[PDB]
Every structure is written in C-alpha cells, then in structure tokens.
Amino acid sequence: MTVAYIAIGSNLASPLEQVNAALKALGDIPESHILTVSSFYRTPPLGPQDQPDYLNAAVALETSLAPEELLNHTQRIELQQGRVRKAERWGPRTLDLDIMLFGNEVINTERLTVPHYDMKNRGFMLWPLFEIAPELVFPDGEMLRQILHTRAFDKLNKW
Template sequence: MSSKHSVYIGLGSNLGESLSQLISAICAISELPDTQVQKASSFYQSKPMGPQDQPVYVNAIARITTALDPHELLSSLQKIEHHHGRVRDGERWGPRTLDLDILLYDTETIKTDDLIIPHIGMAEREFVLVPLFEIAPDMIMPDGLPLSVWVSRCSLDGLKRLASINETSTL
C-alpha cells in the first residue's frame, strides 16, 4: 500500500460561476483515487494578478492526503481543470474558469519542466497565504519561518472573505 502525502492545493477562478466551479473542483479532487480532502478554506475574492482588465478571482485552499505522486496528482488536477472548461492558451495570469496549483507536497522540493514545488510566488500572494493560514495556522514554511510571518508581510489589499464551504448552500 502506498503511503499518504499531505498536500495543499490552491484553487482559483474568475470566469463563469467561480464559486460553484471551486466547490465542484473540491468535490472532484475528493473523488481522485487514494485521495481525501481533509479541509478546505473559506472562499476569498481577490484582485487578478497581471492584467487588471479581467474579472476578480475567487480563491480557496484545500488540504488533501493522497497516495498519488506529484506528477500523477498534477495530471489529475489538469484533467479536472479541463473538465471545468480551462483552456491553456499560453497567456500568463489571464482569466480562467479554473486554476488548480499544487502549493506544497509534504516537505518536498520539486523542479521539473512542468512542476515546481513549493509553488513559486506563494510568499507574495495574499489569496494563497490568508486561506492557507485559515486551515494551517501553525504551519512552518519551506524557509523555516512560521506562516504567520509570511502573512504579516503580504498586502491584504483587495482580499475579501466571501463564505466558508459550510456556508454555501451548494453542498
């Protein structure tokens, strides 16, 4: 039997029914083989990164355990994105129906052509750090600092809590 890994996944959407898409994605993640969603953060509205002439994002973080290796998980997440209408057109930070990012996979560091863990830029992204802090307030980050220090250093400009998954009537 494969061992289980602790993984944090960032979820984002700014096209279509973003909140519904994130809830659906969390459900789809829970249906992956040998994978359980342990906890999901509240949903947050945030300003888009990159071009500002696009809708605001809805973001969340999910903590999962999985027996999938990092590349199997990446492939599975990309299938979920595709199922939700995600089109990979090469535009960086453009609008999307669904974005699923592996932020942390145990304490592993991975650098391949298609996968970098820990996820690049986490330290500057309030829409990652605040929901991550909500579900893992005692986390120590890859640089050895508490997550609370990372949160205290980021701008919270434009970040707004919308609802927890329990507060949505969709589930």
C-alpha cells in the first residue's frame, strides 16, 4: 500500500454536497481506503477571481492501485459529478480532484504529474494537507512544516 494525498475543490452546484458525494465515491474506489479527511475550508479563488469561493479539503487515501489507475477513478468521479469542460482557463467547477502526492513517488506521464506542479505555492492545498499529515516530507526532502513556517500564506477559514 501507498498513501496518496488528494486535494478536493468545488465552487459550483452546492460545494458541500459535491464534496460529501466525492468522499463517498473516493471510499468506493477499489484497492483503496480513506485514512483521513481534513476540515472543509472556504477559500478565495486563485487565478481568475470572477467566480465563487471554493470549498477546499484534502484526503489521505491508502491504495494499492497504480498511480494512473487512481487518476482513472478520480477523473471518473469528477465527470460523474457533472464536471463540464469550458474554454476559459481555471474556471469554476463542480468538483476537482488533484493527486497531490502518491507516497514518495515522482511521476511524469502524459496524463499524470506528481507531486502536483504548483502545490508548494498554494495555501489551499498545503494547509488542509498539514491538518491531516503534519509530519509530511516531500519526495525532494522538503518538510511541509518548514514550508508553512517560512513562507507567507494567508490563514484558511473553515467552511
């Protein structure tokens, strides 16, 4: 088994309902078990700001799936919860499931890049991650606690 850490975001179609449904669906992923769920946070949008605030959270999922097989499931869940692709970059969505980390693995395939390319620059990813995994060390040896101690991020407000 490996522990994967998944970021959850939603800012459309009742984010609390979307995230609760997503958590049930994550539980139903085969060869996998949810270990920990963060608090839910209400976060101002990064990127385009003309969209509603996000519900953000993080989940620890123990799994024996291959990383791309996990991605298959997370994409399926997003699509089954009505995620629609529009033209605008970084627009609102019913559900976003980003694979932040897959154990200590570094993955670079056509479909999957892990660690998530920008997670170390996003408070809405790092704070919920720290809530569920305060001892976390990244594949490059960087400590989550040290990033959050050193770098300026706004505090997150709970939903």
